[PDB]
Amino acid sequence: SFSGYLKLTDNVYIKNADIVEEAKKVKPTVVVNAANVYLKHGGGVAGALNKATNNAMQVESDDYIATNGPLKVGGSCVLSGHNLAKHCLHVVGPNVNKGEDIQLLKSAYENFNQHEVLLAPLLSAGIFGADPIHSLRVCVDTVRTNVYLAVFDKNLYDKLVSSFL
């Protein structure tokens, strides 16, 4: 199962880890992708997860968008986890760099409550432009299911743990 995580709350755990490497090691039931509404997995966590699937995630995602149209900011869809997990929960956090409402971050995290346990990144962090300390706070105040957070950046991980209220 999950190893090396620091327990933050009853249900939230955190580790300084590459979520692709973590998914390949654990092969969890659900890995969360930091998706955009178009499921265009170009960069950040989405680009890394997609590259690990040899682009199979993108091919599957393009078929999903052709059939269903784009997701909503704050929304999600369940697709295959390919070689990384049983399923991938593609969750769209607001992209502050695209001028999207930060209030949608709580709605984005609510998608995690439909899954008993998940391996996930901090939503709207990184190239999505939100403050990762705020994202962690929304995560622990919104998610009630067991979430194992992988934070790629060591310096950010230390700052998140050291400032956790």
Swiss-Prot record:
It comes from the Viruses. Changing residue 29 to A: In strain: Mu/B.1.621. It is a multi-pass membrane protein. It catalyses: Thiol-dependent hydrolysis of ester, thioester, amide, peptide and isopeptide bonds formed by the C-terminal Gly of ubiquitin (a 76-residue protein attached to proteins as an intracellular targeting signal). It is found in: Host endoplasmic reticulum membrane. Residues 1-165 form the Macro domain. Inhibited in vitro by GRL-0617. May form homohexamers. Interacts with N protein. Responsible for the cleavages located at the N-terminus of the replicase polyprotein. Participates together with nsp4 in the assembly of virally-induced cytoplasmic double-membrane vesicles necessary for viral replication. Antagonizes innate immune induction of type I interferon by blocking the phosphorylation, dimerization and subsequent nuclear translocation of host IRF3. Also prevents host NF-kappa-B signaling. In addition, PL-PRO possesses a deubiquitinating/deISGylating activity and processes both 'Lys-48'- and 'Lys-63'-linked polyubiquitin chains from cellular substrates. This is Papain-like protease nsp3.
